[PDB]
Scaffold this active site. Structure first.
Site, PDB file in Angstrom:
ATOM      1  N   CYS A 153      -4.588  30.126  53.230  1.00 29.91           N
ATOM      2  CA  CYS A 153      -4.361  29.326  54.611  1.00 29.91           C
ATOM      3  C   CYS A 153      -5.145  28.082  54.457  1.00 29.91           C
ATOM      4  O   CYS A 153      -4.975  26.560  54.617  1.00 29.91           O
ATOM      5  CB  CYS A 153      -4.282  29.938  55.830  1.00 29.91           C
ATOM      6  SG  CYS A 153      -5.911  30.749  56.141  1.00 29.91           S
TER       7      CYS A 153
HETATM    8  N1  LIG Z   1      -2.977  36.174  58.601  1.00 28.85           N
HETATM    9  C1  LIG Z   1      -3.113  35.020  58.103  1.00 28.85           C
HETATM   10  O1  LIG Z   1      -3.432  33.680  58.658  1.00 28.85           O
HETATM   11  C2  LIG Z   1      -2.926  34.846  56.636  1.00 28.85           C
HETATM   12  C3  LIG Z   1      -2.987  33.885  55.838  1.00 28.85           C
HETATM   13  C4  LIG Z   1      -2.906  33.710  54.436  1.00 28.85           C
HETATM   14  C5  LIG Z   1      -2.922  35.003  53.634  1.00 28.85           C
HETATM   15  N2  LIG Z   1      -2.822  35.936  54.289  1.00 28.85           N
HETATM   16  C6  LIG Z   1      -2.513  37.313  53.648  1.00 28.85           C
HETATM   17  O2  LIG Z   1      -1.556  38.350  54.210  1.00 28.85           O
HETATM   18  C7  LIG Z   1      -2.088  39.506  53.823  1.00 28.85           C
HETATM   19  C8  LIG Z   1      -2.198  40.463  55.072  1.00 28.85           C
HETATM   20  O3  LIG Z   1      -2.989  39.728  56.081  1.00 28.85           O
HETATM   21  P1  LIG Z   1      -2.608  39.936  57.768  1.00 28.85           P
HETATM   22  O4  LIG Z   1      -3.682  38.820  58.197  1.00 28.85           O
HETATM   23  O5  LIG Z   1      -1.165  39.876  57.921  1.00 28.85           O
HETATM   24  O6  LIG Z   1      -3.503  41.238  57.720  1.00 28.85           O
HETATM   25  P2  LIG Z   1      -3.306  42.405  58.926  1.00 28.85           P
HETATM   26  O7  LIG Z   1      -2.802  41.547  60.124  1.00 28.85           O
HETATM   27  O8  LIG Z   1      -4.208  43.191  59.129  1.00 28.85           O
HETATM   28  O9  LIG Z   1      -1.992  43.233  58.525  1.00 28.85           O
HETATM   29  C9  LIG Z   1      -1.863  43.938  57.301  1.00 28.85           C
HETATM   30  C10 LIG Z   1      -0.507  44.913  57.406  1.00 28.85           C
HETATM   31  O10 LIG Z   1      -0.658  45.529  55.948  1.00 28.85           O
HETATM   32  C11 LIG Z   1      -0.697  46.933  56.117  1.00 28.85           C
HETATM   33  N3  LIG Z   1      -1.460  47.736  55.249  1.00 28.85           N
HETATM   34  C12 LIG Z   1      -2.760  47.693  55.160  1.00 28.85           C
HETATM   35  N4  LIG Z   1      -3.038  48.703  53.846  1.00 28.85           N
HETATM   36  C13 LIG Z   1      -1.901  49.073  53.487  1.00 28.85           C
HETATM   37  C14 LIG Z   1      -1.671  49.948  52.355  1.00 28.85           C
HETATM   38  N5  LIG Z   1      -2.722  50.403  51.673  1.00 28.85           N
HETATM   39  N6  LIG Z   1      -0.299  50.168  52.218  1.00 28.85           N
HETATM   40  C15 LIG Z   1       0.902  49.763  52.961  1.00 28.85           C
HETATM   41  N7  LIG Z   1       0.428  48.784  53.811  1.00 28.85           N
HETATM   42  C16 LIG Z   1      -0.750  48.610  54.082  1.00 28.85           C
HETATM   43  C17 LIG Z   1      -0.819  47.069  57.596  1.00 28.85           C
HETATM   44  O11 LIG Z   1      -0.292  48.275  57.903  1.00 28.85           O
HETATM   45  P3  LIG Z   1      -0.853  49.369  59.335  1.00 28.85           P
HETATM   46  O12 LIG Z   1      -0.405  48.858  60.420  1.00 28.85           O
HETATM   47  O13 LIG Z   1      -0.330  50.815  58.893  1.00 28.85           O
HETATM   48  O14 LIG Z   1      -2.051  49.505  58.845  1.00 28.85           O
HETATM   49  C18 LIG Z   1      -0.565  45.963  58.079  1.00 28.85           C
HETATM   50  O15 LIG Z   1       0.984  45.965  58.113  1.00 28.85           O
HETATM   51  C19 LIG Z   1      -3.566  39.496  53.393  1.00 28.85           C
HETATM   52  O16 LIG Z   1      -3.406  39.686  51.908  1.00 28.85           O
HETATM   53  C20 LIG Z   1      -3.809  38.182  53.491  1.00 28.85           C
HETATM   54  O17 LIG Z   1      -4.637  37.403  52.595  1.00 28.85           O
HETATM   55  C21 LIG Z   1      -2.753  36.148  55.777  1.00 28.85           C
END
Ligand SMILES: NC(=O)c1ccc[n+]([C@@H]2O[C@H](COP(=O)([O-])OP(=O)(O)OC[C@H]3O[C@@H](n4cnc5c(N)ncnc54)[C@H](OP(=O)(O)O)[C@@H]3O)[C@@H](O)[C@H]2O)c1
EC number: 1.2.1.38
Length: 347
Positions: A153
């Site tokens: 981001c």
């Molecule tokens: N949010 C942002 O603004 C943003 C921006 C750029 C990139 N990203 C990227 O998007 C990715 C996720 O971020 P987020 O912010 O969406 O995180 P988040 O809100 O914490 O959600 C993480 C997701 O991953 C799942 N998960 C965690 N460990 C897992 C595993 N071992 N196997 C399968 N699923 C698993 C979780 O499932 P459970 O509910 O079962 O734990 C949840 O569905 C990251 O790599 C991050 O770098 C996010």
């Protein structure tokens, strides 16, 4: 041109996964039956309904979250990976090779192995076409791709703010970025320091002085538009908003403002998602929330001999999920703007 695409989302219960689903529900291919929403997977959330995680996504509330496994993910033409980094290489290997795999995490973003290892502490897995279509040469690598690494981001805001000036050689290659962000950027894993009582009414810089992993990602995107030695001072600041990134980007300049503005015009005049502010206006994150837009203004501080570029994005849309769907559209040969509004949801 793809005719009919069944999509899965691994990490569906998280913020990025939720936002991919929001945009897919609004996508015209969903409406006309060409894009179909399949398996929604997570880790410990498996067995629960999606409504328990994303009560805003009522048309899908009843979907049961499944485990994140190759057997569950098989039989989908496209798979979004919205998981913490360090799973997508392992996971991507298990999927049918012809699957369009769209990774929201960092694993396939970086092109230098020693930089990767330094910041991420693992062996570099390699790199996939970078999901930032507005970067020079980026859109060509995305057309018909089966692999997308979605940008971080903060690098999205920083690169959009800085690359035209640097490409035109109108600023020095030592850049400074101080970017504020809403808290959804940190994800949905519960920690004390992301609790509402902690973040509301407070602001704090974190991961300062070159330790933030998005630092080398900004440097990489910039090194692609110049031969000069790039340095990046990057400071992220958490603010009391749920969404939004406002990146303040500076570098030394002795170029006339009109030449800098011409470089932005050239870069962005035909880019549907980039909005150059009218004279006397400046971007605000409020104006871009829930859109795939980046609003940008540039200026010169003559006394300080400093270029200033401001870029506002929604961290979850242009910063993440919107970037992912924009790149998906490219990969499938569909109109790039499909499902992706430039109109913000404000106030
Ligand atoms: N949010 C942002 O603004 C943003 C921006 C750029 C990139 N990203 C990227 O998007 C990715 C996720 O971020 P987020 O912010 O969406 O995180 P988040 O809100 O914490 O959600 C993480 C997701 O991953 C799942 N998960 C965690 N460990 C897992 C595993 N071992 N196997 C399968 N699923 C698993 C979780 O499932 P459970 O509910 O079962 O734990 C949840 O569905 C990251 O790599 C991050 O770098 C996010």
């Amino acid at each position: 041109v793809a005719n009919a695409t069944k999509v899965a989302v691994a990490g569906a219960s998280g913020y990025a996964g939720g936002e991919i689903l929001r945009l897919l529900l609004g996508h015209p291919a969903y409406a006309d039956g060409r894009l179909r929403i399949g398996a929604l997977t997570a880790a410990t959330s498996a067995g629960s309904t999606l409504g328990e995680h994303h009560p805003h996504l009522t048309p899908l509330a009843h979907r049961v979250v499944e485990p994140t496994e190759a057997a569950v993910l098989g039989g989908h033409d496209a798979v979004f990976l919205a998981l913490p980094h360090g799973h997508s290489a392992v996971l991507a290997q298990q999927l049918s090779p012809e699957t369009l795999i769209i990774d929201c995490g960092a694993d396939f973003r970086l092109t230098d192995a020693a930089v990767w290892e330094r910041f991420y502490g693992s062996s570099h897995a390699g790199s996939w076409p970078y999901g930032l279509p507005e970067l020079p040469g980026a859109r060509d690598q995305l057309r018909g791709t089966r692999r997308i690494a979605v940008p971080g981001c903060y690098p999205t805001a920083a690169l959009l703010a800085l690359f035209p000036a640097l490409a035109a050689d109108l600023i020095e290659p030592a850049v400074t970025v101080v970017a504020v962000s809403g808290t959804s950027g940190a994800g949905r894993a519960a920690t004390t320091d992301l609790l509402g009582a902690e973040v509301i009414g407070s602001a704090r810089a974190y991961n300062i002085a070159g330790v933030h992993r998005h630092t080398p990602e900004i440097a990489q995107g910039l090194r692609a538009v110049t031969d000069r030695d790039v340095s990046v001072s990057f400071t992220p600041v958490l603010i009391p908003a749920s969404r939004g990134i406002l990146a303040t980007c500076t570098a030394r300049t002795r170029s006339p403002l009109s030449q800098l503005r011409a470089a932005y015009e050239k870069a962005y005049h035909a880019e549907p998602f980039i909005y150059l502010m009218p004279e006397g206006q400046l971007p605000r994150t409020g104006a871009v929330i829930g859109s795939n837009a980046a609003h940008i203004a540039v200026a010169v501080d003559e006394d300080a001999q400093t270029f200033v570029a401001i870029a506002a994005i929604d961290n979850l849309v242009k910063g993440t999920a919107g970037a992912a769907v924009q790149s998906m559209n490219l990969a499938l040969g569909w109109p790039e703007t499909d499902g992706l509004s430039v109109v913000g949801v404000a106030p």
